[PDB]
Amino acid sequence: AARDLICAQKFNGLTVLPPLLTDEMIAQYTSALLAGTITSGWTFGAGAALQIPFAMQMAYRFNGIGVTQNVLYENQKLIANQFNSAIGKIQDSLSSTAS
Amino acid sequence: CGKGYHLMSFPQSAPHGVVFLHVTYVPAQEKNFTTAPAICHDGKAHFPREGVFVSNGTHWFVTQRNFYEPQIITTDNTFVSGNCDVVIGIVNNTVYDPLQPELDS
Ligand SMILES: *[C@@H]1O[C@H](CO)[C@@H](O)[C@H](O)[C@H]1NC(C)=O
Numbered sequence: 001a002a003r004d005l006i007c008a009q010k011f012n013g014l015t016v017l018p019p020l021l022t023d024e025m026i027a028q029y030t031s032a033l034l035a036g037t038i039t040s041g042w043t044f045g046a047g048a049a050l051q052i053p054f055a056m057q058m059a060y061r062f063n064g065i066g067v068t069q070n071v072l073y074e075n076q077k078l079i080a081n082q083f084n085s086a087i088g089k090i091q092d093s094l095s096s097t098a099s
Numbered sequence: 100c101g102k103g104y105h106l107m108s109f110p111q112s113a114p115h116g117v118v119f120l121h122v123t124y125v126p127a128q129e130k131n132f133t134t135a136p137a138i139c140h141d142g143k144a145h146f147p148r149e150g151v152f153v154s155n156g157t158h159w160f161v162t163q164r165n166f167y168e169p170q171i172i173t174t175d176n177t178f179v180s181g182n183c184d185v186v187i188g189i190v191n192n193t194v195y196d197p198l199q200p201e202l203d204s
């Protein structure tokens with residue numbers, strides 16, 4: 001075709017180095033962090049990862065903000081549906097707007 | 100302030116800088132357990148005040164989260180909210196009332 005900009009930059013002595021960590025290693029780190037915070041709660045960031053059920057971790061996280069834990073256990077389907085709708089709206093927000 | 104659960108920190112001097120000695124709390128030896136979110140006793144649902152419900156295989160105990168010391172499930176360390184047909188995963192266990200034997204004398 002024609003002369004590219006990057007070929008001119010390479011021919012004039014300007015070189016772009018590649019990063020040390022690939023995208024696959026970044027994705028592996030992100031997946032490990034997600035799995036740790038999903039299964040073990042916050043205990044994996046302070047030593048050994050201690051497993052817990054997720055509803056009981058959710059009860060602790062409501063307890064930390066000042067709401068008693070019986071609010072979650074009596075309404076757990078509503079928190080589940082609200083979380084599902086909230087994480088589903090991020091998909092429709094990111095699939096259309098590019099700003 | 101360091102890695103772990105923070106307790107203190109001790110500053111130290113250095114050439115062109117400062118050195119901190121963070122003191123932290125690290126849990127060491129864990130063992131695995133069976134747990135339930137709540138206790139159905141006498142048609143009422145019991146939730147712990149602080150801590151967690153654990154089972155050693157036969158009985159049900161209450162203990163704190165960051166350490167393992169088992170205690171008997173009591174009315175003093177539990178509170179009642181609703182009936183045992185809404186909470187998912189509720190089990191059956193007796194609840195000790197300290198007021199009844201002090202009444203019966
Ligand atoms: C407890 O049980 C789980 C499930 O089998 C097992 O993976 C784990 O090694 C056991 N021990 C501890 C200390 O968690």
Ligand SMILES: *[C@@H]1O[C@H](CO)[C@@H](O)[C@H](O)[C@H]1NC(C)=O
Binds near residue numbers: 139190191
């Ligand atoms: C707990 O007791 C109630 C009535 O006493 C009974 O209906 C229920 O099935 C019991 N729970 C289990 C897990 O068996």
